[model samples]
Target: DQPVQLKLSEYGVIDNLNWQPMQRKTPLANEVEIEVAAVGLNFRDVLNALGLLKDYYAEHFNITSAEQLTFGFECAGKISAVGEQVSQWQVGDEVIGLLLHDGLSSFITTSVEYVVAKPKQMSFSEAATLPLTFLTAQYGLQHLAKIQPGERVLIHAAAGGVGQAAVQIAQVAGAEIFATASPSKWEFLQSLGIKHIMNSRTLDFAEEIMKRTAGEGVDVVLNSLNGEYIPQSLAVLTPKGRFVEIGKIGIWEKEQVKEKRPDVSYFPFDLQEAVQQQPGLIGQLSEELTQQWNQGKLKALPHKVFPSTEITAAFRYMQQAKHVGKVVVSMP
Candidate 1:
C-alpha cells in the first residue's frame, strides 16, 4: 500500500501543500513498515512547514538536493512488515515509534530501533502525542538538568506539549513548579498541579520569579523562547543556578548572553542529537513514560483530534495557539 505522505509543494516551502499518496519504500535490513493510525502535531512541524527547519533537519539527516521531505515523526500504528533481521516485534503488533519523519502517511518503513509497543490503555491518538514531548522533557529535565525534588523550576510555554510534560515530570519528582502560560490556561496549568502560574503574554518572566521567590530565584529553568527572553531568564536564576537553554540560540552563548547572574551555569540540550547518537533512548524513555501513565503518575496532555485529511487545518489550529495540550490528526 502507498503511504499518504505530507510534503511541501516544493523543496523550500509549505505553501499550498496537500496530503498526497506517495510510493512506499522497501524495508531495509533493520527496518519495519507500519500502517500508521495517527500523527501528532508539534510547533516544530509548523516551523518545518514554513522551512525554518530546512537547514537543521537537512544537515541532521544528511539530506541532499534530490531528496523529498516528509512530516510526522511521532506516530502510533500497527506493524505491516518487518526486516529479515528484526526481532522482538512482528507484523500486526500495535505500536508507537520515535520516527523522525514519514509519519503523516498511511504506511511507514522505518528503522526497528525506534519502535515500542503501544499501551493497550491508550488510544492511537493519545499514544502518538507522547514520544517527541516525552523525550524532550524527560531527557532535558531529568538527564541534562538533573532536576531534584524540592527545587523550584520555571517552565515556559507550560500549556504546550513540552512545557506540559516538563511540569508533569517535575511535579512527580516533588519539585516546586512555576510555569508561564496564558491567563486562559492558568486554570488548566493548575489542574496539572502547577501552583505558580505566570502569564507569559504580559508579565516579565524574570520579575515574576523575583517577586514570587522574594529574590531567591529558581533552581532550574526549562526555556525554549527566543533570545529576547535570555537575560530575563538569567536574572531570575539563583547562584550556580542551572539555566537549561532549549531555545533557538547558542551552546556557548550560555555565557555570551549573560548580562547579570554571573555564577549561573548553562546546559544547552538538543533532544534530536541525543536521540540520533543513542538510537534506543526514545524507546527506553517511552517505556518509562508508559510506566508513568500506567501507574497513575502521568496523564498525557489533553488534545484536539482532527482527521488526517485536515492536515492544513491542523497546522492552522496549532498556529492559532488556542490549544491547551496537543493537536492530533488521525488517519482516515
Candidate 2:
C-alpha cells in the first residue's frame, strides 16, 4: 500500500520534525494494522524527550533499556487489515489502543487484545487520548480506591488529563470532587461540577482539603505527585480511606547531565511507609479499581492537536506545562 510515514530520526531535539517516504507493512497473524489518525501526548512524553523516562522505568519499574524513543502513546486510527485469527474486529473499523512506546508513525500493528472499538459519539482526537489517562484514572478510582458514593474525594493536578478524567469519573459515582490546580484554571474545574478548588501552586493542598471537609478528612486522595506529596496526602486521608498514586511526574529525573541520578530508592521506601501505616492498602486499593468506561462517565479534554511534522513542538508544549488537557498529533 502507498502510505506516508514519518521516521523518528528526522527530528532534532529542538526543531520541528519532517515527514519521509516509507513502506507500510501488512498485518501479521493475530494482529490488526491501523492507518494512524491521531496520537496523544502526555507529561511522560515530555519526560521522555527530556531523557527522564529511562530513569523512571529503571528506578520504579526496575526496567532498563527503556531508552529515548519516538513520541506518542495513546492513539486512534482506522483498521487497514486484520489478521486471519482476529474475529472481533474487521477492516475499516475505527479503534484506539495504548501502545508500549512507538505510535507516532503513519501506521501501527498490534494484537487485538490491546485495541478497543472507538465509540461512535467520540471523535478520533478524543479516542486517541483515552488509553493512558483513562486507564490510569479508571484503575485508580475503581480498582485502587473503591470510592463510595457521597464520599469526599481530593484530586491533585485536577486540571491535567488524568486529574480531569478523575473528577468526572468520581462525580459520576456520586462523590463530591475536590481538585487542586493553578489559580488560572480554577474556573475551568468549577465549570466541570467541581465545587471545591484549591490552588496547589501556592496553598497547602492537604490543609485545604481538611479545612473544606470540616476536619473530617477526605475519604480518598488521588495524587500524581511523588515522595513530597505522599506523606501529606496520607495524613489527610480519613481512617480507612484510600490514596491512589497515578502520577509519577515528580519522581521523574530531569534532563541535566550533572543531575542524571536515579530516584528509584523512593519507590520501595514509600511502599514500606504505606504498609506500616495502612497495611495492605495498596493491594486492596488496586483490586477495587475498575476499567470499564461507562458511557458519558468521563470525557477527553484535548488541549492541542499537532500535525505529524510538529512532533517536537508538541513535546516542547508539554514540557512548558502550558496546556491544561491532553495534547495530540494528527497523521493526515
Candidate 3:
C-alpha cells in the first residue's frame, strides 16, 4: 500500500501549509479511517485561521494545541477501513463525522461514535456542512433555549447557515420566526418563511421585535453575538424567556476595553457582574434545549460548497459578511 499524506494549513493571511506523509496505522478500537470527500468551513474555522479562538479547546475543558493547528471541524467521506471492534459501519460506506481537529485533509481517522449515517438525500458536500453548525444550533435551541411550540423565537443572523437552520427549526417547532439580517436579505428571509424580518445592520432589531410582538416580548432569543447584546436581548425577552449566546464575536472586544481601562466603565454591569447575576441560568437552559434536537424535532441548515483549493477565497468571502448560508470545502 502507498504511504498516504495529508496537508495541513491555514487559509487567509497565512498560507504555506506543510504536508506531512503519515503512515497508516492499524485501526484503533471502535475507530474508522475515511477517504475524505468533503469538509465544512465554519465561522469558527475562520476565527481559528485568524488566531481568534486559539483558546477555545483549552477554555472549554479540552486539550490545548501546542503545534501549528490545521483548520477543519466537520467532514463527510467514504469509510475506507474500520477497526475490528466496529460493527455498525462497513468499508466503502458513505458517512459524515465530526473531528476535534485535522479535518482539512485528504483523509482522516475518527471514532465511530462521532460518525453518523449521512442522509440519503444529501450529497457529500451538503452532509459535510451539517455536523458543526447543526450541532451548535441544536445545542443552542434545544439545549439552551428549550423552545416550545407556538412560542415566539427570534434568530439573529437569520440568513446565515446556523441562522437559517435555526429559523427553519424554530418554525418547524411551531414557533413564529422573527429573524434579523441586512435589508438586502429581507426577501430571502421571507422566502424561508420568516414572518418578521428586521434589518439588524441598520435598524434597532430589539426595538422592532418589541413593537412587533406588541411589547409582550419573545419566548426565546438565539443570539450569536457576544454578551454586549445580552442586555438588549433580555429586554426583548418575556419573563422566563431563554437567551442563548452561541456566537462570541463581540465578547472579546468588551474584554479588551476592560483591560485597557481599569476603572473606566460605561455599561451598567461588567462581565463578572453579568455572570454572577445569571449564575447557572445558561447551563440549566441548555440542558433542557438539547433534548429537542436529539429527538429529531429540529432540522439541519443548508450550506454552499467549494473545493478545498478554493478555501482561501471562501474565507475571504465569509469575512465580507455577505454569504447567506454555510460555506464548505468539497474534496474532488
Candidate 4:
C-alpha cells in the first residue's frame, strides 16, 4: 500500500490541506521504518499551518515554500522494518518517537535512537501525546533547571500541552506547584490538585505567588508567555531559581536577563535545536520518561483523538484550543 501524508498547498488555508502520497524508502543501517498508527498535533503544527512559523521553518527546515512543509512532530507506531545494526528494537515493536519534521505520515523511517518502547498500558494515540510535550517538559524541568524536590514551581499557561506535562513532571519531582492559566482553565488545574491557581491573562499572578509564598517567590518558573510577562516572571524568581523559557516570540535575550537577574539561571529551550546539538539527548530523556511510566509516576495526559480523514476538523479543533491535554490523529 502506498503511504500518505498530510500537507497544505498554501499557508493559513486549511482547505488546501490534502493527503499526498509519500515515497517509501528503506531504513539505513541505524534507522528503522515505522507504520504510524497515531500522530500528535502540537501548537507548533497549528502555527506552522497558519504561516506564523514561516521564518522558523525557513531557518530550521530550510524550506523556501509553504508546500515544502509537513506538520506533526510526534507519532506512535509499530516498527515494520528494522536496521541490521539496531540491537534494542525489532520489527513489530510498539513505539513512539519525535521528528524534526514530517511525522504526519502513514510510514516513517527514522534513526532507531529517536524511538522508545511504548508502555503496554497506553494506546497508540495516548503514546503519541507523550513525545514532544513530555520531552520538552523533561528537558526543561529536569535537564536544564535541575528542579529540586520541595521547590516551588510556577508554570504559566498550565492548561496547554507542554504546561500539562510540566505540571505532571513537577508533581513527580515533589514540587510545590503554582499554576497560571486563563480563568476558564483554573478549575481544570484545580482538578489536577494544583493548590495555587491564578489568572495568566494578567500580571496579577506575580503578586499572588509572592503573597501566597509569604514573600518568597517560586524556585523555578516554567514560562511560555512573552512581553511584560517575561520580566514579570523574572521578578517572581527566588535568588538562584531557574527560568526556563519555551516561548518563541518576544523572549528576553540572555544578555539582558543576565544583566538584570544574574543570580538566576536563564534557559531558552528549543528541543529540536538541543537534539541537533546533542544527538543522543532525546534518547536519554525518553529512557528516563519510560522509567517514570513503569514506576507509575507519570500517565498520559487527557487527549482527544481524531481520524486522519477528518484532518481539517482536527486542526480546527486544536486551533480553537477546545481540547485540554492534547489533540491526536489516527492513521487509517
Task: Give candidate 1's error at residue 69 in angstroms.
Answer: 1.1
Q: Score candidate 2 by TM-score against the native.
A: 0.79
Instruction: Write the residue-wise lDDT of candidate 4 on 1-332 in tens digits.
Output: 97898889999898889999989888899999999999999777887888988887788768878888888888999999988888888889998876647789888888877878887889998888888888999999999998889999999989888999999899999999999888889889999999999888899998999899889999999988888889999999999999999988678889999998999999997899898899779779977887888788887878888988999998888866622558989999
lDDT of each: 0.78, 0.67, 0.66, 0.87
Identify the runs in model 2 with alpha carbons over 4 angstroms from their true place: 1-22, 55-68, 249-295
RMSD of 3: 6.8
Q: How many steric overlaps does candidate 3 have? A: 6
The whole-model C-alpha lDDT of candidate 1 against the native structure comes to 0.78
For all predicted structures, in order, the TM-scores are: 0.91, 0.79, 0.78, 0.94
- Taking every candidate in turn, the Cα RMSD to the unseen true structure, in Å, is 2.4, 7.3, 6.8, 1.8
**Residue 233 miss distance in model 4 (angstroms):** 1.4
Q: Best candidate per lDDT, number?
A: 4
Residue 315 CA error for candidate 3 (Å)?
A: 2.3
Candidate 1, 7-66: lDDT as tens digits: 777554445557776787778889898888988887667766676666786677765432
- Which candidate, 1 or 2, has the higher lDDT? 1
Over 4 Å off, model 3:
1-12, 17-22, 57-67, 252-302, 321-323
lDDT of 3 by residue, 54-89 (tens): 676466436354245666777888898989899999
